[PDB]
Amino acid sequence: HEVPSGPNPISN
Amino acid sequence: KFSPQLLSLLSLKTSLSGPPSAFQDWKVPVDAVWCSWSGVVCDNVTAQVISLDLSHRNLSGRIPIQIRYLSSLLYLNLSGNSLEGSFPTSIFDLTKLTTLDISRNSFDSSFPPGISKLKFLKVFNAFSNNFEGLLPSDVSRLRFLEELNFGGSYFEGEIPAAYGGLQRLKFIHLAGNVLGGKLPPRLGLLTELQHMEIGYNHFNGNIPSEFALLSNLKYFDVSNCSLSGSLPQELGNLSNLETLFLFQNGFTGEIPESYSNLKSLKLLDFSSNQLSGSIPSGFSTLKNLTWLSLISNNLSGEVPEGIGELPELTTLFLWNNNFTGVLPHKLGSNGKLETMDVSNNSFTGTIPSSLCHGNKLYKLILFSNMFEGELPKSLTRCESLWRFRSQNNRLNGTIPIGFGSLRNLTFVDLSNNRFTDQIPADFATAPVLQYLNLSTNFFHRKLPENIWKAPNLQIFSASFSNLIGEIPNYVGCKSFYRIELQGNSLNGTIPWDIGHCEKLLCLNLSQNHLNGIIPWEISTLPSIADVDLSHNLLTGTIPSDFGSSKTITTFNVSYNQLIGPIPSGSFAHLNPSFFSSNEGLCGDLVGKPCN
Numbered sequence A: 001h002e003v004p005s006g007p008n009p010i011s012n
Numbered sequence B: 001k002f003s004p005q006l007l008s009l010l011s012l013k014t015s016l017s018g019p020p021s022a023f024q025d026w027k028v029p030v031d032a033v034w035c036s037w038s039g040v041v042c043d044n045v046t047a048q049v050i051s052l053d054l055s056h057r058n059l060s061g062r063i064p065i066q067i068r069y070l071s072s073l074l075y076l077n078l079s080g081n082s083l084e085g086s087f088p089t090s091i092f093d094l095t096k097l098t099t100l101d102i103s104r105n106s107f108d109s110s111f112p113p114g115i116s117k118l119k120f121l122k123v124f125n126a127f128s129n130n131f132e133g134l135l136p137s138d139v140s141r142l143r144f145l146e147e148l149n150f151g152g153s154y155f156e157g158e159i160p161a162a163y164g165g166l167q168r169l170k171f172i173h174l175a176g177n178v179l180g181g182k183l184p185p186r187l188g189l190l191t192e193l194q195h196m197e198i199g200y201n202h203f204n205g206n207i208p209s210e211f212a213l214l215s216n217l218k219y220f221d222v223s224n225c226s227l228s229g230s231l232p233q234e235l236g237n238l239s240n241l242e243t244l245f246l247f248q249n250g251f252t253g254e255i256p257e258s259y260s261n262l263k264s265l266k267l268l269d270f271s272s273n274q275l276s277g278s279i280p281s282g283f284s285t286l287k288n289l290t291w292l293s294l295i296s297n298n299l300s301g302e303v304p305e306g307i308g309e310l311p312e313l314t315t316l317f318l319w320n321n322n323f324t325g326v327l328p329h330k331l332g333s334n335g336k337l338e339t340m341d342v343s344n345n346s347f348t349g350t351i352p353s354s355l356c357h358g359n360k361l362y363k364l365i366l367f368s369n370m371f372e373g374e375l376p377k378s379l380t381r382c383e384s385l386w387r388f389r390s391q392n393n394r395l396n397g398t399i400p401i402g403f404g405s406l407r408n409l410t411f412v413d414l415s416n417n418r419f420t421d422q423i424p425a426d427f428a429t430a431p432v433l434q435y436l437n438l439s440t441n442f443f444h445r446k447l448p449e450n451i452w453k454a455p456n457l458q459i460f461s462a463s464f465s466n467l468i469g470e471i472p473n474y475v476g477c478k479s480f481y482r483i484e485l486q487g488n489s490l491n492g493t494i495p496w497d498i499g500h501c502e503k504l505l506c507l508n509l510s511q512n513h514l515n516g517i518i519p520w521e522i523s524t525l526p527s528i529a530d531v532d533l534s535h536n537l538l539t540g541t542i543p544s545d546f547g548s549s550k551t552i553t554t555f556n557v558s559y560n561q562l563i564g565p566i567p568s569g570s571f572a573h574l575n576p577s578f579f580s581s582n583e584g585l586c587g588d589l590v591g592k593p594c595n
């Protein structure tokens, strides 16, 4: 299954 | 007769099931023909298969035992298929294998315990499968292993401490399983390790102090687990670290001042933890830093002035803390700043004039602080600006002219500030502005006459500002779908050419001083669903045609001076409260029958 990579993508 | 290489390949053809295109060309005519076959590379002398590539051929089924006869195979790639069943132990008899990649399949059950027989294995990639049970301790015996990927499955338990003894390991990836317990300190013994990706698991405890011995580590990620306690101070000794992701955990305490020693750090993300205290002023020395993220912690105090002159800083995220004081007045001067979000803090003072020094700033989010003073004219020359959210501050003065000239400006929220005087007329001429909220200010002025000629512009609100005078004619009101003008002092009549707003869906003109009649053209609007014209001085009838406007779900005209019968059709099924406080209005709907 897919797994997140990189910095936290949260945004305003 | 037939070479075992040929028969072994043909076994694969018949053991795996895919589309006809999968093995079309694996054809035997009427010697060493298999060397022309796609995915097959042979030793040019002996004709044996040394590399076999069946990646991304839409295959399913199981690996047949006959694969063991491909005995001088070095490279094997089965990735991006639908292979199932337990991992096939016959692969362990391919004892010359240097590269084995089975990523992106559906292999399941426990991982079989025979992999040490693959003595010369350099690269092992099993990313994204269905394995479960314990992580195979067996892989500990692979003394030449350089790259190990076991992520994206459902492996449980702890990380075998024995993995510490993989003396030539450079890359390890175990992210996205159900691993738990404490990270074994023995992993700090991996001298040549450069990449450690192990988050999206359930690890508890801290990060082992002996991890500070991974002198070669360039990339470290243990985000989205259950780590807690203080950040380990000793991680300062890691002078090659380029990437540090520790977000979405439960660390507490202060950020160690020793992290100022991470001179090659580029990305730092401590989002969503429970850190407190102040950003270490030693962060001013992290000159390679490009992405600084501390979203959603319990941080406080002032941002060190020096983070405003980090030369490489591109992305600055501090929202959802409680920082105080002003923004470093030189922030932006590096010519490199692209996106910045410091919303929901307690910042004071002015917005620095240099935020956009190199035309790279595209996202500026400032909302919910206590920024004050005038809005910097320099933002009106921020050529690259796209999204600007600065609502809920104390920004005062006239909103400057200039924003109409920015080709990519598309979202502007300046609501709930303390702005005065004219709204800029050039807002009506900005080429791609889609959202513009000016609600809750103190203009004491008319709308710009040209307002409704905004080409793209879908949502426009200026409710509860202090708007006066009359609503401009709705000339070509091209892409609007939401208009909010409640709670002002608008007078005169609703413009009768409102029918130009073909895309309109919600319209709130309530709580003004509008008079005259309801414009008939509202009936010709294709998609209108919400109308609120309550608390005004409107007179006249509600046009009968409104009853055949199939799309209307809300039509609040309460507290007016309308008269005549409430229409019937759609209007038969609406809330009676929409029609109250209108002495002259009548109809079965509202309980006062007609005549």
Ligand SMILES: *[C@@H]1O[C@H](CO)[C@@H](O)[C@H](O)[C@H]1NC(C)=O
Residues within 6 Å of the ligand: B055, B056, B077, B079, B099, B100, B101, B123, B125
């Ligand atoms: C296996 O094949 C895929 C698809 O061609 C490729 O992208 C991947 O890097 C290969 N794996 C190895 C270990 O070379």
Ligand SMILES: *[C@@H]1O[C@H](CO)[C@@H](O)[C@H](O)[C@H]1NC(C)=O
Residues within 6 Å of the ligand: B209, B212, B234, B236, B237, B258
């Ligand atoms: C590495 O760096 C810091 C510098 O303050 C030092 O004090 C710390 O004890 C070192 N880590 C260890 C325990 O080896």
Ligand SMILES: *[C@@H]1O[C@H](CO)[C@@H](O)[C@H](O)[C@H]1NC(C)=O
Residues within 6 Å of the ligand: B297, B320, B321, B322, B344
């Ligand atoms: C604002 O930030 C605080 C942390 O200081 C947080 O607790 C709160 O939820 C944030 N506001 C929201 C709900 O966005």
Ligand SMILES: *[C@@H]1O[C@H](CO)[C@@H](O)[C@H](O)[C@H]1NC(C)=O
Residues within 6 Å of the ligand: B322, B324, B346
């Ligand atoms: C944030 O800091 C200010 C200054 O002390 C304080 O008055 C305010 O209440 C703080 N907010 C929170 C979330 O504690």
Ligand SMILES: *[C@@H]1O[C@H](CO)[C@@H](O)[C@H](O)[C@H]1NC(C)=O
Residues within 6 Å of the ligand: B362, B386, B407, B408
């Ligand atoms: C405008 O801004 C966004 C975000 O930077 C970008 O994806 C888009 O392509 C830009 N378009 C133009 C005209 O530069």
Ligand SMILES: *[C@@H]1O[C@H](CO)[C@@H](O)[C@H](O)[C@H]1NC(C)=O
Residues within 6 Å of the ligand: B391, B415, B416, B437, B438, B439, B440, B459, B461, B482, B484
């Ligand atoms: C405009 O801003 C006001 C006040 O900030 C807010 O409450 C409202 O939801 C916004 N309107 C729209 C359409 O986003």
Ligand SMILES: *[C@@H]1O[C@H](CO)[C@@H](O)[C@H](O)[C@H]1NC(C)=O
Residues within 6 Å of the ligand: B469, B470, B491, B492, B493
């Ligand atoms: C609306 O208010 C202004 C301000 O006094 C007044 O001069 C003007 O005549 C009014 N317009 C209408 C149509 O009543």
Ligand SMILES: *[C@@H]1O[C@H](CO)[C@@H](O)[C@H](O)[C@H]1NC(C)=O
Residues within 6 Å of the ligand: B486, B506, B508, B510, B530, B531, B532, B554
């Ligand atoms: C119109 O605005 C008033 C004032 O905020 C509000 O109470 C009502 O929910 C709004 N109605 C619609 C349909 O937007």
